[PDB]
Design a binder for this molecule. Structure first.
Ligand SMILES: CC[N+](CC)(CC)Cc1ccccc1
Ligand SMILES: [Mg+2]
Ligand SMILES: [Mg+2]
Ligand SMILES: [Mg+2]
Lengths: 352, 352
């Protein structure tokens, strides 16, 4: 019984308030990048070693690779082409784990010993991610790298904790954000926004650190919101910030939703206050990520918000009128045919 | 300036909530443990490798190791002697890194590659800490270990950031929590309260995870609260959670203090509220930690809370007397002369 209606009352405030307006790229640029990124990642995930260690249903690997290339490209609009590709590999790995089961425990028992000795991790995921990492890290200075590493690590714990579908003992007010922060790849996204070929870690240490701290919550709440739909009646997505707010904080799915919104709205207000007068170049990237990020949410299959445009394309509310007005802008700019960039299929590359 | 009355009220409330009371920890036992831990550690830090790779003025090392042994022994009341010893070494390392003013950049440049390769780290602090870690992790299961490994890493970055003496951009509301969390060592503390020889993560996963989640905030805010007296006039330490709230949030020092207190009390309440009915054995570890922690704050000279007792030992106010009650209780069990356990000095062990 997805609340609907109210969903719009939320989405609209956010979009209207952040003055949603994806302006980055040109149809003739957007595709150049979608294809470049998809091409490298797909060639990578098609190798035998990757194919044999990453346990993923071919179909899901493909859908994920596409949702990721879409995310990297639409949000990291100011980084190099190579950078998007390598980021797309790293984020495609994390998405595989985010949607998977399997118990880590058995393989994580000698984690730190194998680490300190230089011995491939028992867990296949760690074995492939740690092997690939260097191709992501080369694009960054040391500090931003630490952030990427830590975050990827935290995210690993989060997925683990998530495998107990636990929303927290009622009255464990802290639990909710504790868990969301742990699996939101906050510091990983925020730091990967600053390639060294384009930024000087030491010269912009303060702005970059501030961006990591602030963007962590914006980035995650916006997703907690936009994807409230697709994560509604799905297992594994059963445990979400909103849903755990209810359990742990003891309130109604209606209030928890208002909570997430009042927050998201504030994060947004402070992003601007803080980064407006600062280095134009920084603002530009934050700006592009924020708009591009929303464009992707209103366009990728994963979040399937189409099943809402075509479910309210009728209800003439001053609310669902704005929602649809927005959804339109989005697809208009970011709705592309996979037939123009996502090819050939990863599988087809694998059996060669 | 200085809310002597307001502080007292908040302190008594916090002590009340957590039920600050009579431990079953006998003063003769406290001394057994204080000496055991101090001894293994002093012998460790007196090793030559340690002696030449750890840059710390001998007197501060001596003092630091002592403050730590006290903190551990008085708070990890239910763990074995070896456990207290090994945690005492790891926590002394961390505390010692704040004395370092050296830029992590040059040594962090090849962090990930040396790591993945199994080559000794460039930054000496890492070389020692990572080499000693097994000595600590062996006391815990895999889950709990991951947590320690992560916090220590987050800790390293926080030190890095703190080197910039930056309290946050005005309006960057998410910065103080971000930073305090970065170097709070929360998930480390929380996860180190459950040795595998006494608990089973698999069976108590949700209880443990939840503790980590709530303890992270409790432990850091309670420390920020007790430290609020010594740091009040400390022009040296410019960036403290509260002082950052002042700058980042743009509020009066008093308003920020008001913020900490609310979070601290509320955090305390929810602690009990959530763990009273839970496994008895677990609530004991929690219940005891909170008490010794406070006992330690009340007893370690570094916080100079005795200066307060010396200024309200006669007022006939309910708060003022309640305070003294608790203090004399703590002094009763905790006030122990260093001569009784901390010997011989590390310096003397080093020449031998
Ligand atoms: C990158 C962070 N994200 C983006 C939608 C929001 C918290 C979740 C995510 C996790 C794992 C793979 C892809 C996306
Ligand atoms: Mg996830
Ligand atoms: Mg998910
Ligand atoms: Mg979500």
């Amino acid at each position: 019984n997805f609340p609907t209606e109210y969903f719009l009352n939320t989405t609209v405030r956010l979009l209207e308030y952040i003055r949603y307006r994806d302006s980055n790229y040109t149809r003739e640029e957007r595709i150049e990048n979608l294809h470049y990124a998809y091409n490298k990642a797909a060639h990578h995930f098609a190798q035998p070693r990757q194919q044999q260690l990453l346990k993923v249903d071919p179909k899901r690997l493909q859908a994920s690779l596409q949702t990721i290339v879409g995310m990297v490209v639409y949000s990291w609009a100011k980084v190099s082409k190579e950078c998007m590709a390598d980021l797309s590999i790293h984020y495609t790995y994390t998405l595989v784990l985010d949607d998977s089961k399997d118990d880590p425990y058995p393989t994580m028992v000698n984690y730190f010993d194998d680490l300190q000795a230089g011995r491939e991790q028992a867990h296949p995921w760690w074995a492939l991610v740690n092997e690939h990492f260097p191709n992501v890290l080369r694009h960054f200075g040391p500090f931003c790298s630490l952030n990427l590493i830590r975050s990827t690590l935290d995210f690993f714990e989060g997925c683990w904790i998530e495998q107990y579908n636990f929303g927290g003992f009622p009255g464990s007010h802290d639990y909710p954000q504790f868990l969301r922060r742990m699996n939101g790849l906050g510091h990983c996204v925020g730091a990967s926004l600053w390639p060294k070929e384009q930024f000087n870690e030491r010269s912009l240490f303060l702005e970059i650190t501030s961006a990591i701290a602030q963007m962590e919550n914006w980035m995650v709440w916006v997703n907690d919101l936009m994807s409230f739909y697709k994560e509604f009646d799905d297992e594994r997505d059963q445990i979400s910030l909103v849903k755990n707010y209810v359990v742990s904080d003891e309130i109604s799915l209606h209030e928890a939703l208002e909570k997430l919104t009042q927050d998201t709205l504030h994060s947004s207000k402070q992003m601007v206050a803080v980064f407006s007068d600062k280095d134009p170049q920084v603002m530009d990237t934050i700006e592009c990520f924020m708009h591009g990020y929303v464009t992707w949410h209103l366009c990728d299959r994963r979040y399937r918000l189409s099943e809402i445009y075509e479910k309210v394309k009728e209800e003439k509310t001053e609310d669902a009128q704005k929602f649809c007005k927005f959804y339109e802008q989005a697809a208009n700019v970011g709705a592309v045919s996979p037939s123009e960039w996502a090819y050939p299929p990863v599988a087809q590359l694998a059996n060669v």
